[PDB]
Every structure is written in structure tokens, then in C-alpha cells.
Amino acid sequence: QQFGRDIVDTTDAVRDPQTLEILDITPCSFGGVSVITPGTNTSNQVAV
Amino acid sequence: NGLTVLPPLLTDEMIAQYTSALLAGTITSGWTFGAGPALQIPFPMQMA
């Protein structure tokens, strides 16, 4: 076998076609970005 | 694939300190804590 696949078809492993190693795979990071403002009638400071 | 579960605001240890204050107001005061100040009553007398 060459590929790899979790439940929901999603390649989660592969095997070098030039050394034959099982190399797992994991998506690059991502997520939201929220901004906490005290109020523009009070300050222009913010936290993220 | 761009989907993310967000955490709840009240930890399950905070939802259990609210359930402990409701059970320690009934066993030691009665129905007096949900209407005004909590007033103590011996327990066998609240069941009466």
C-alpha cells in the first residue's frame, strides 16, 4: 500500500517513493483573529 | 478544512460551584434565599 487515509477521505500518511519511509502529514496552522477594544471614546489600545 | 469548535466561557468547575451554592442555600435557609436575604432555619423545621 502507498497512500494513507483517515475516515473522511483525507491523506494522513504517505510513503517516500525513493527511500520507502512512512511520513505522516498534518495541516499548516490556522484559526480566527479577534480584537479586544476598550472603546474608541476611551482609548486606541487593543489586544488580539 | 476551515472548521473550528470554540470553547465555552464557563469552565465545568465553575458550573459546579454554582450548583454547590444552590444546594447549600436550600439545606441551610429554605426558599428564603431566592426572595431576599438568606435566613437560617433548623432543617427538620423546614421539612415541617
UniProtKB/Swiss-Prot annotation, chain A:
Residues with glycosylation annotation: 41
Self-association state and partner proteins as the record states: Binds to host ACE2. RBD also interacts with the N-linked glycan on 'Asn-90' of ACE2. Cleavage of S generates a polybasic C-terminal sequence on S1 that binds to host Neuropilin-1 (NRP1) and Neuropilin-2 (NRP2) receptors. Interacts with host integrin alpha-5/beta-1 (ITGA5:ITGB1) and with ACE2 in complex with integrin alpha-5/beta-1 (ITGA5:ITGB1). May interact via cytoplasmic c-terminus with M protein. May interact (via N-terminus) with host bilirubin and biliverdin, thereby preventing antibody binding to the SARS-CoV-2 spike NTD via an allosteric mechanism.
Function (record text): Attaches the virion to the cell membrane by interacting with host receptor, initiating the infection. The major receptor is host ACE2. When S2/S2' has been cleaved, binding to the receptor triggers direct fusion at the cell membrane. When S2/S2' has not been cleaved, binding to the receptor results in internalization of the virus by endocytosis using host TFRC and GRM2 and leading to fusion of the virion membrane with the host endosomal membrane. Alternatively, may use NRP1/NRP2 and integrin as entry receptors.
Record protein name field: Spike protein S1
Taxonomy of the source species: Viruses, Riboviria, Orthornavirae, Pisuviricota, Pisoniviricetes
